[PDB]
Amino acid sequence: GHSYEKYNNWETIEAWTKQVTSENPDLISRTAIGTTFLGNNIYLLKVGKPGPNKPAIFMDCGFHAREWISHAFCQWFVREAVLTYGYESHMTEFLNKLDFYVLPVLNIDGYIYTWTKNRMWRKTRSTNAGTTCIGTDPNRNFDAGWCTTGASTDPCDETYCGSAAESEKETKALADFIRNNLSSIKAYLTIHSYSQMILYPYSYDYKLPENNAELNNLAKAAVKELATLYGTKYTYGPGATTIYPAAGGSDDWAYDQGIKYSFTFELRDKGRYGFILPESQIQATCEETMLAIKYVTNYVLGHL
Numbered sequence: 001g002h003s004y005e006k007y008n009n010w011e012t013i014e015a016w017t018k019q020v021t022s023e024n025p026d027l028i029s030r031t032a033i034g035t036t037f038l039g040n041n042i043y044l045l046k047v048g049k050p051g052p053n054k055p056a057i058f059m060d061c062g063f064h065a066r067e068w069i070s071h072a073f074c075q076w077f078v079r080e081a082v083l084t085y086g087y088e089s090h091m092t093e094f095l096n097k098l099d100f101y102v103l104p105v106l107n108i109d110g111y112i113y114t115w116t117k118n119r120m121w122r123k124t125r126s127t128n129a130g131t132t133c134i135g136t137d138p139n140r141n142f143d144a145g146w147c148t149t150g151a152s153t154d155p156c157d158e159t160y161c162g163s164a165a166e167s168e169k170e171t172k173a174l175a176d177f178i179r180n181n182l183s184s185i186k187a188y189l190t191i192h193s194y195s196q197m198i199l200y201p202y203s204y205d206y207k208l209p210e211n212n213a214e215l216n217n218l219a220k221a222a223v224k225e226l227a228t229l230y231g232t233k234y235t236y237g238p239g240a241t242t243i244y245p246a247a248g249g250s251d252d253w254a255y256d257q258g259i260k261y262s263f264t265f266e267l268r269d270k271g272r273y274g275f276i277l278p279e280s281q282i283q284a285t286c287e288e289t290m291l292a293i294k295y296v297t298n299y300v301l302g303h304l
């Protein structure tokens, strides 16, 4: 069975996407935007009060297989949305005025592998010609300074950038969807762990985005807001200087598509447990993260 305070395997998450949609058809619709390399369904949940000509925010989780708290957050977010709609004024206004496209698990094949074989797997599970080595790093697979830095051209490495930009069915599916909905998508949020950061462009180069002052101010406010709940401290900044230059990232790509608010989140913790964050921290992690996501949403809506 599904639990919002435990990590759920894909079979369970999948069943959840069907159930939560069935239980909230006036707030959620489920579509599939493609299949993974191993034929799993890439579900996308459209969360919001249905209406014509609505702007939208896109959020994905589960790019990297071992970052389990990421997957957990997308599920937590959906429940908060549906349970509080009509009662909490902000979320009610959010869902009335816009749609959240929530993609709960992008790299499903990798996620399954972390359950069945290797808890520390990161990449996809696609095969590579000429080698037994498996998988491409999805966050090096986008058309953003593709493979020019912070990436490997070797299929055996954890940062393999792929045979070409969007060589992975999963990243192609995500890019295709966003490209088809550019007119409506006003912000792109991509959830990772760990390190407690909010990153914004650019990561593929040290250059700064045209609106970097605004993004910095937005990130600073979001981290302040996050800290109010449990005191959790995040840092923030351009990806390249805040972690390290890394080309082919989905956040850089989305931004260069014209999506002016594009952020990567790195959730708890700072390395005590790392990727193996205990389920006992799921609730608190998700609750504080909600505050930052809602803050960003409120800002974006107020600046349409």
Ligand SMILES: CC(C)[C@H](NS(=O)(=O)C[C@H](Cc1ccccc1)NC(=O)OCc1ccccc1)P(=O)(O)C[C@H](C(=O)O)c1cccc(CN)c1
Pocket: 064, 139, 140, 150, 151, 159, 192, 193, 194, 195, 199, 203, 239, 240, 243, 244, 245, 246, 249, 250, 251, 252, 264, 266, 271
């Ligand atoms: C613990 C997290 C910070 C993950 N990092 S990781 O699993 O250790 C692998 C990652 C691989 C890499 C190679 C070359 C250049 C940059 C990054 N290494 C890394 O982040 O090392 C730094 C580090 C290590 C431990 C704790 C904090 C920071 P991530 O979510 O996988 C980081 C993410 C990525 O590597 O795709 C990322 C790095 C730079 C910029 C962005 C924004 N697009 C996103």
Ligand SMILES: [Zn+2]
Pocket: 063, 064, 067, 192, 193
């Ligand atoms: Zn990651």
